[PDB]
RNA sequence: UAAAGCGAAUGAUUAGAGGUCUUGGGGCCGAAACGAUCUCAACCUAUUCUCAAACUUUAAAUGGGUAAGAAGCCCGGCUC
RNA sequence: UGGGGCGGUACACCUGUCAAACGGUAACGCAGGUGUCCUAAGGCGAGCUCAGGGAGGACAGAAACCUCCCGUGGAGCAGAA
RNA sequence: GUCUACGGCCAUACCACCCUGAACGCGCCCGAUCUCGUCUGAUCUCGGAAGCUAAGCAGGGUCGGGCCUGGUUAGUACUUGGAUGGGAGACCGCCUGGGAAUACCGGGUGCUGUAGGCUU
């Protein structure tokens, strides 16, 4: 036999980690580097544009760090695009670009910077960045909080970056992780970036398979088929989506129905009951042992 | 040992010395250097003692009380100082008094376990208590 | 003769407590220090960069300068008979706001409140602190039963 | 009514050929797997020197290869067929895996190469189930619970159910 | 630091209990054999006697600092 | 310089204790180290997680290679701690 | 009632094992055409949404271990200052003030900030 590791001593000496290190979600090292201000700033906020891509969504938030717990100035989600006529592809690069456009215009709408700071309207895909205006209220700036994503070539965060930047935010960035950087040659095809942004990558995959074999097409693209989505319609769909967003991005909340009020969960068991169980078990055991003998 | 062997026979007691000597004592030897750099080599061990600390203990029956006494009184002459010979209230080498002991063992609070004895509390899981009474 | 090394006799001072090793909670960094704010010092082993010298450990002073990540701070060190106010550059992690001054400032604010009121009335409210007085006379109702008689127990030798 | 989410599958097969030497023996035994699988195996080297057996620290000794899926099922089928569908008890581990080792691959059926030579090799089957990569994904790790673990007994009865494969003591 | 602690870490250290092989030395009916057989060995689990200037979770008394208002509080407004 | 001499270097340096709970403190007192090494064993970023033990598998054996499980650091970070 | 994203304090929140989870989410889930990376599309990257809560997660459970908090231990040990106090010495008692720690016996098992969901 061998020594049991997990004794009392072990648990006494055992340090606990933070809640968000146990759940595996938050990296505190990077949080530290990202978030504090220089002391000579004195209470001047350091904004950060968080981006959290889920299984079936892409959330983009803005946050600044107070001691009580990081305050959100404004927040968007993907599932509002059915209102603006986008039924599917909510975790594609295009819907990332869309979400960045919302975040930008909703924020600028609150701060009263609507006629000023339009940005890139024509989606060429080359480099655009917001020059500050002389004699006017300066540009918004915030630093990117990728979080845990491996900052690899072709990521929906940097898609959302290109979108939100064109919406007009002063985020510093290179174009190196945008799709286009040939690893050998090191040049950037922005038009190919356009292609991914407009969604030809999906159309071309669905044609290649429809040509190849119809059955995979039917297994893969069910809701696409149901909703009568086609290669030709997709581009103008996303383009109208841009125009609708630019015009009226703001969110109106839903009316709360009076709640039914029922407890699905089981409440915690009181003292007297806990005291009773072992009494019944011992008495019942003694009389049952009489049954055995 | 010698006295108890002569008196109460080969199997009527258990002596237990309770003082392990850890302190090391030094010695300063003089072999012409003199007194300079004089820090000693090890001569040997010895055990430090506070007031009220037990040196020896002898367990046997209460019948052979005075003979135990006479052994310890003869043993005083090897040690220095002064020491008192006190008969213990404890049942053997335990921390539990003799009057309430048999009641406690009958109701199975304490359980013999060779020379030692295990105190059962109520804090464990109950299926152990079931195994005990079964 | 002993050595004049910087970390002499700091086997236990800087060692972090039990089950409190590891990462530094971010409040430390994300809290602010103004000029003239009274600040007390507490060394910390994790960050070796910018540790104050052990002598200044415990000492509390006021902040004369600020940089990106640090504060110069004035302390009164005693040397052989004269004291020297002297200034040390400390990175923030080794620092706390000493809360001694806040209760006094609460009392000034309380007096200006208590003076604005009870001004028109003309009642003369005691502003000053008045030291712990001799307790006044009072009645002890022995309702019924009598005092329990304590007796010194007789000696008995356990050992 | 048991759930479809416990269809007991194979995660991976782990081949290795520890010849214990560098150079010509090795490059040829690596090329044998090259002939079998059509894919480049990985050379592992030693932690430290042992002069009795004649190996030094950091010496490229062995070669190994991971395999997953149908290609693995096929090669497993041939291997067991050579082992005539019967194993021992001691072959099964407590974590629910198992393995075995043919003394030489030529036994499998593949022609001998004079230049390459003959080589024994060593199979090892890591079974799994749906819902094991939680512990190995980054974003939110987590232990997989008690029921979902694969027992030694349940792997034995599963092999016994599948191929009517007998298990013998040892 | 004194103390206290080792049924809590580290480091020494005495004593008997229960285990099966996690292995082994002497036998004895056994050729041997994890059959058994007496054993006695180390390991594992609950206990028990004793310790620490260069071990410590705990942890005092005495002490060392800082503050106890005009150099302060509260209003109105310029400059960068 | 516990007479000088012969012997040590306590003649400049560093860690722990002696130190009497801020800091500061002595003896040819104690236990010990130094007169170097580095093209990276320095600098950024990413990705990996160690010591030890258990059960399995041709040659393979107490000890060679692969695999699962436990693993608050019991390893390691050139060197004294 | 309860959840998601981002959090502060960092075990009353950990570990082990058993039971139950309406709705949307969270998850698992099916593929490799393009971007990307592999011994291996398992991990990482990307395109889907037929199936399922089995696991994860949540809540509850355990005369559970632990951790946190109380009483007891104890006005004991120890200690600031005093005396033509004792005692052959070791050491000890008194006045004046400060005052602990295990075993043992009880009790507890996350608090909460912003924005946005479900019960339309
Ligand atoms: Mg002591
Ligand atoms: Mg001289
Ligand atoms: Mg000191
Ligand atoms: Mg001192
Ligand atoms: Mg796959
Ligand atoms: Mg589930
Ligand atoms: Mg408990």
């Amino acid at each position: 036999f061998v020594k049991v590791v997990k004794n009392k001593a072990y648990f006494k000496r055992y340090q606990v980690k933070f809640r968000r290190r146990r759940e595996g979600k938050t990296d505190y090292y990077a949080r530290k580097r990202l978030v504090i201000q220089d002391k000579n700033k004195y209470n001047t906020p350091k904004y950060r544009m968080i981006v959290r891509v889920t299984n079936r969504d892409i959330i983009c938030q803005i946050a600044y760090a107070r001691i009580e717990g990081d305050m959100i100035v404004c927040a968007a989600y993907a599932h509002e695009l059915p209102k603006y006529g986008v039924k599917v592809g909510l975790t594609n690069y295009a819907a990332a670009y869309c979400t960045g456009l919302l975040l930008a215009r909703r924020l600028l709408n609150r701060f009263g910077m609507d006629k000023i700071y339009e940005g890139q309207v024509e989606v060429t895909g080359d480099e655009y960045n917001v020059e500050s205006i002389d004699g006017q209220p300066g540009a918004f700036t915030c630093y990117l909080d990728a979080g845990l994503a491996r900052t690899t070539t072709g990521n929906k965060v940097f898609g959302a970056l290109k979108g939100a930047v064109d919406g007009g935010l002063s985020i510093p960035h290179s174009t190196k992780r945008f799709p286009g950087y040939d690893s050998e040659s090191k040049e950037f095809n922005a038009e190919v970036h356009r292609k991914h942004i407009m969604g030809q990558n999906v159309a071309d995959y669905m044609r290649y398979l429809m040509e190849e074999d119809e059955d995979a097409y039917k297994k893969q693209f069910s809701q696409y088929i149901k909703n009568n989505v086609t290669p030709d319609m997709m581009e103008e769909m996303y383009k109208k989506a841009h125009a609708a967003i630019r015009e009226n991005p703001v969110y109106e909340k839903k009316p709360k129905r009076e709640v039914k009020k029922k407890r699905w969960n089981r409440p915690k068991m009181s003292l007297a009951q806990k005291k009773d169980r072992v009494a019944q078990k011992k008495a019942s055991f003694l009389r049952a042992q009489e049954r055995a003998a | 040992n010698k006295y108890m062997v002569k008196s109460c026979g080969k199997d009527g007691f258990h002596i237990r010395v309770r003082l392990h000597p850890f302190h090391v004592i030094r010695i300063n030897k003089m072999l012409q250097t003199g007194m300079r750099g004089a820090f000693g080599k090890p001569q040997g061990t010895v055990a430090r003692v506070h007031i009220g600390q037990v040196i020896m203990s002898i367990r046997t029956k209460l019948q052979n009380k005075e003979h135990v006494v006479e052994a310890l009184r003869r043993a005083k002459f090897k040690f220095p100082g002064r020491q008192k010979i006190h008969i213990s209230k404890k049942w053997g080498f335990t921390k539990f008094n003799a009057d309430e002991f048999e009641d406690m063992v009958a109701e199975k609070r304490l359980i013999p376990d060779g020379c030692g004895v295990k105190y059962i509390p109520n804090r464990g899981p109950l299926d152990k208590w079931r195994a005990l009474h079964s | 003769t002993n050595t004049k090394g910087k970390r002499r006799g700091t086997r236990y001072m800087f060692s972090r407590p039990f089950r409190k090793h590891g990462v530094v909670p971010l409040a430390t960094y994300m809290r602010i220090y103004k000029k003239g704010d009274i600040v007390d010092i507490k060394g910390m082993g994790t960050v070796q960069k910018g540790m104050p010298h052990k002598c200044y450990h415990g000492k509390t002073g006021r902040v004369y300068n600020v940089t990106q990540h640090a504060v110069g701070i004035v302390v009164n060190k005693q040397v052989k008979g004269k004291i020297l106010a002297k200034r040390i550059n400390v990175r923030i992690e080794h620092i706390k706001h000493s809360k001694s001054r806040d209760s006094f400032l609460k009392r000034v604010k309380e007096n200006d409140q208590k003076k604005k009121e009870a001004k028109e009335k003309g009642t003369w409210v005691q502003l000053k602190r008045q030291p712990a007085p001799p307790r006044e006379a009072h009645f002890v109702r022995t309702n019924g039963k009598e005092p329990e008689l304590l007796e010194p127990i007789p000696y008995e030798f356990m050992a | 009514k048991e759930n479809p989410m416990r269809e007991l599958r194979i995660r991976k097969l782990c081949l290795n050929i520890c010849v214990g030497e560098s150079g010509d023996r090795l490059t040829r035994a690596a090329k044998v797997l090259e002939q079998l699988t059509g894919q480049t195996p990985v050379f592992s080297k030693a932690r430290y020197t042992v002069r009795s057996f004649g190996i030094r620290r950091n010496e490229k000794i062995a070669v190994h290869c991971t395999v997953r899926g149908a290609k693995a099922e096929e090669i497993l089928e041939k291997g067991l067929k050579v082992r005539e569908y019967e194993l021992r008890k001691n072959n099964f581990s407590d974590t629910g895996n198992f393995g075995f080792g043919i003394q030489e691959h030529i036994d499998l059926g593949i022609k001998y190469d004079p230049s390459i030579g003959i080589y024994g090799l060593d199979f090892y089957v890591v079974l799994g189930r749906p819902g094991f990569s939680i512990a190995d994904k980054k974003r939110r790790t987590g232990c997989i619970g008690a029921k979902h673990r694969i027992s030694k007994e349940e792997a034995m009865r599963w092999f016994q159910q599948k191929y009517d494969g007998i298990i013998l003591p040892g």
Side-chain angles (χ1 to χ4, degrees):
Chain A
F1 284 73
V2 293
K3 191 67 79 70
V4 176
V5 180
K6 303 165 97 162
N7 303 329
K8 286 186 182 181
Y10 173 75
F11 292 122
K12 291 204 173 193
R13 302 282 320 291
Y14 190 90
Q15 182 162 7
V16 306
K17 283 282 198 281
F18 287 152
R19 191 163 58 80
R20 319 284 303 227
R21 179 64 263 197
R22 282 187 269 94
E23 294 171 7
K25 309 184 170 171
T26 303
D27 175 32
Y28 279 82
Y29 187 87
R31 214 173 159 206
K32 180 173 146 180
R33 305 297 162 75
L34 268 158
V35 90
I36 74 193
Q37 265 280 86
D38 298 6
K39 300 289 99 196
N40 60 356
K41 306 290 176 69
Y42 304 87
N43 203 1
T44 293
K46 190 168 200 186
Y47 297 97
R48 76 205 182 174
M49 205 271 278
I50 294 158
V51 181
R52 290 283 179 281
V53 177
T54 336
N55 57 38
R56 306 195 183 78
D57 205 302
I58 301 175
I59 307 159
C60 297
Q61 303 174 249
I62 299 185
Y64 65 105
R66 288 281 169 278
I67 194 169
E68 286 87 42
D70 47 9
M71 298 200 72
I72 317 309
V73 71
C74 186
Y77 294 89
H79 70 77
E80 302 168 358
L81 301 175
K83 294 175 208 172
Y84 310 101
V86 194
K87 303 194 286 285
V88 297
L90 295 90
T91 195
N92 64 31
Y93 186 96
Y97 179 98
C98 296
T99 313
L101 182 56
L102 207 62
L103 182 58
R105 299 308 306 181
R106 193 176 286 183
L107 186 79
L108 274 45
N109 183 259
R110 182 189 297 266
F111 303 139
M113 303 188 294
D114 59 332
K115 306 312 302 184
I116 307 105
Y117 307 129
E118 296 298 333
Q120 199 83 329
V121 196
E122 268 302 328
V123 191
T124 310
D126 265 347
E127 185 49 282
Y128 185 73
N129 43 16
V130 183
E131 59 82 37
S132 173
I133 301 160
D134 298 81
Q136 290 284 16
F140 188 98
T141 170
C142 63
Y143 310 119
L144 188 82
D145 203 357
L148 288 168
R150 182 62 169 74
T151 50
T152 42
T153 311
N155 187 298
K156 287 173 274 187
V157 303
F158 302 121
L161 174 57
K162 187 63 169 171
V165 166
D166 288 23
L169 274 48
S170 300
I171 305 193
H173 57 84
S174 155
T175 62
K176 201 187 181 188
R177 301 290 100 168
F178 298 141
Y181 179 75
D182 182 46
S183 315
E184 190 53 81
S185 316
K186 309 190 177 181
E187 297 101 6
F188 178 54
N189 301 331
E191 192 57 33
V192 178
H193 188 206
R194 193 186 191 285
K195 294 292 179 195
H196 283 236
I197 299 154
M198 310 318 298
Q200 307 291 8
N201 276 119
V202 180
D204 73 347
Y205 184 45
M206 62 148 56
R207 289 155 175 164
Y208 184 77
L209 293 167
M210 188 164 165
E211 189 274 313
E212 285 168 295
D213 280 317
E214 200 83 339
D215 292 68
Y217 168 53
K218 294 182 175 188
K219 188 163 177 81
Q220 175 61 22
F221 293 103
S222 187
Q223 312 265 16
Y224 269 67
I225 287 166
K226 191 179 161 286
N227 296 255
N228 309 317
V229 183
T230 48
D232 56 334
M233 190 178 193
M234 203 194 296
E235 182 167 39
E236 294 289 351
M237 175 269 287
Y238 281 107
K239 286 189 187 182
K240 287 280 181 183
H242 298 144
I245 293 160
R246 297 271 288 196
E247 196 276 317
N248 190 61
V250 69
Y251 187 68
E252 195 183 349
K253 296 184 81 173
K254 297 182 184 180
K256 189 184 289 181
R257 194 194 172 184
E258 190 63 41
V259 181
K260 296 299 295 189
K261 299 287 285 185
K262 67 174 306 323
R263 206 187 180 79
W264 291 118
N265 207 335
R266 199 186 210 221
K268 189 132 63 175
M269 199 181 185
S270 74
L271 178 54
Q273 292 172 329
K274 184 80 175 179
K275 212 81 166 182
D276 183 31
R277 197 189 277 203
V278 299
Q280 292 167 12
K281 274 187 167 173
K282 287 187 270 183
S284 174
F285 183 71
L286 294 164
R287 72 197 302 176
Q289 196 177 322
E290 186 72 284
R291 185 178 177 182
Chain B
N1 178 256
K2 196 65 55 55
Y3 190 83
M4 196 52 74
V5 165
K6 291 166 187 172
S7 175
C8 202
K10 56 187 259 181
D11 48 296
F13 62 87
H14 177 228
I15 293 170
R16 181 76 157 285
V17 175
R18 297 168 67 171
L19 279 182
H20 299 255
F22 293 115
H23 192 291
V24 172
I25 206 69
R26 291 193 298 274
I27 170 62
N28 179 223
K29 196 167 179 181
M30 301 291 190
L31 307 172
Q32 301 191 335
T33 56
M35 210 74 201
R36 77 177 65 176
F39 184 75
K41 302 296 99 179
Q43 201 198 346
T45 54
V46 70
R48 314 192 92 177
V49 185
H50 300 260
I51 295 163
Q53 184 172 359
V54 177
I55 302 172
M56 293 174 62
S57 303
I58 309 190
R59 59 189 260 275
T60 186
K61 298 187 80 67
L62 67 149
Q63 296 163 26
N64 309 137
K65 181 170 50 184
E66 277 65 3
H67 300 279
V68 169
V69 165
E70 183 56 31
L72 294 181
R73 169 269 188 198
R74 283 200 185 191
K76 291 208 301 193
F77 292 94
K78 307 306 182 178
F79 302 120
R82 210 190 83 165
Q83 308 90 311
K84 196 35 74 188
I85 296 163
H86 175 252
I87 286 167
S88 198
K89 301 183 77 63
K90 307 296 189 181
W91 183 287
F93 302 171
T94 63
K95 59 166 181 169
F96 305 109
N97 294 49
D99 65 326
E100 213 65 14
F101 188 82
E102 295 276 280
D103 293 14
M104 290 163 81
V105 170
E107 77 198 332
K108 302 186 174 179
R109 280 194 163 285
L110 303 180
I111 299 159
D113 195 69
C115 190
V117 71
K118 288 216 283 283
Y119 173 80
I120 294 198
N122 310 349
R123 301 202 318 283
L126 199 70
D127 301 317
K128 185 204 260 185
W129 175 93
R130 289 171 175 170
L132 253 294
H133 292 225
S134 65
Chain C
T1 317
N2 297 329
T3 45
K4 265 96 185 150
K6 276 181 203 79
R7 284 188 62 174
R8 196 255 302 165
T10 64
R11 169 171 193 169
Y12 303 86
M13 190 182 300
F14 297 129
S15 73
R16 295 217 47 70
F18 190 56
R19 308 207 318 279
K20 286 196 160 292
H21 298 269
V23 177
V24 50
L26 306 190
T28 66
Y29 293 84
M30 77 212 299
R31 70 209 314 143
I32 83 178
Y33 298 128
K34 303 272 277 288
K35 292 207 298 191
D37 289 8
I38 292 161
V39 162
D40 68 70
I41 301 155
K42 180 194 186 181
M44 169 188 291
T46 46
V47 187
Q48 297 93 42
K49 295 200 80 162
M51 264 205 298
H53 193 244
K54 64 181 183 277
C55 56
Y56 307 115
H57 190 115
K59 318 261 158 293
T60 305
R62 69 186 167 90
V63 180
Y64 84 102
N65 191 52
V66 184
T67 53
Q68 272 59 20
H69 321 116
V71 288
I73 173 161
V74 181
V75 284
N76 285 352
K77 185 178 168 182
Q78 181 165 331
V79 175
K80 319 204 151 66
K82 49 168 155 51
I83 298 170
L84 287 160
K86 62 191 303 207
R87 44 190 81 232
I88 61 181
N89 302 308
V90 288
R91 177 150 291 185
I92 304 140
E93 290 85 326
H94 314 113
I95 318 176
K96 299 181 288 191
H97 288 96
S98 202
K99 296 198 294 301
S100 42
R101 194 68 168 182
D102 291 23
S103 57
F104 170 58
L105 179 78
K106 289 284 281 180
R107 195 172 53 75
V108 171
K109 190 179 174 182
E110 188 169 29
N111 283 14
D112 290 23
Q113 179 60 40
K114 292 246 155 186
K115 191 170 281 186
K116 249 169 170 184
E117 181 94 20
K119 189 260 289 175
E120 78 291 351
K121 295 173 83 185
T123 315
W124 195 74
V125 181
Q126 193 66 20
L127 300 166
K128 281 176 162 72
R129 282 135 53 206
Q130 194 276 318
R135 66 214 162 195
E136 201 166 338
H138 57 100
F139 282 67
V140 177
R141 49 197 64 263
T142 180
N143 199 337
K145 56 76 166 177
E146 290 172 307
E148 185 276 299
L149 174 50
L150 300 184
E151 293 283 71
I153 61 186
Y155 179 80
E156 60 94 8
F157 189 43
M158 294 68 65
Chain D
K1 296 181 174 180
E2 193 172 36
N3 195 280
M5 299 305 294
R6 306 218 310 159
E7 285 197 333
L8 204 163
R9 313 268 93 202
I10 301 169
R11 291 294 91 174
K12 59 172 174 285
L13 187 68
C14 305
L15 316 179
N16 70 296
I17 299 166
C18 182
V19 291
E21 302 101 343
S22 172
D24 53 347
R25 287 294 306 283
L26 176 65
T27 190
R28 288 181 292 161
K31 294 173 190 292
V32 176
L33 292 163
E34 190 162 25
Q35 288 162 4
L36 176 48
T37 63
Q39 49 176 119
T40 53
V42 180
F43 299 99
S44 176
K45 48 168 69 63
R47 278 182 163 277
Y48 46 81
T49 194
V50 188
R51 294 71 79 191
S52 181
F53 310 132
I55 57 169
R56 302 198 298 285
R57 181 159 168 283
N58 307 344
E59 185 168 31
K60 289 183 186 179
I61 274 171
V63 54
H64 64 291
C65 183
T66 49
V67 193
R68 330 183 92 96
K71 310 269 104 171
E73 195 286 344
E74 298 300 330
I75 296 162
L76 181 152
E77 189 66 16
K78 285 180 157 123
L80 298 171
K81 191 175 176 177
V82 175
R83 288 282 194 173
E84 61 171 302
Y85 299 85
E86 52 170 49
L87 302 168
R88 300 88 172 284
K89 292 281 214 303
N90 178 9
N91 289 26
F92 286 81
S93 68
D94 67 345
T95 56
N97 315 138
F98 67 101
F100 55 93
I102 66 172
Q103 200 168 326
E104 51 187 64
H105 72 262
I106 192 177
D107 287 303
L108 187 170
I110 297 169
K111 283 210 302 177
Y112 168 82
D113 180 24
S115 309
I116 291 163
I118 317 175
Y119 287 108
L121 81 90
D122 297 62
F123 288 76
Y124 202 77
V125 178
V126 180
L127 299 179
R129 229 183 268 273
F132 286 158
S133 73
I134 305 153
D136 287 5
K137 67 175 196 171
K138 179 73 168 292
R139 181 160 160 73
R140 293 188 75 179
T141 53
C143 177
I144 69 186
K147 294 287 202 65
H148 211 66
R149 276 194 292 281
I150 305 165
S151 58
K152 184 162 176 281
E153 293 288 307
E154 195 159 25
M156 282 191 291
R157 75 181 199 77
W158 178 86
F159 177 70
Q160 193 166 24
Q161 185 263 9
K162 185 71 178 294
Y163 309 148
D164 311 329
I166 69 180
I167 302 160
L168 270 303

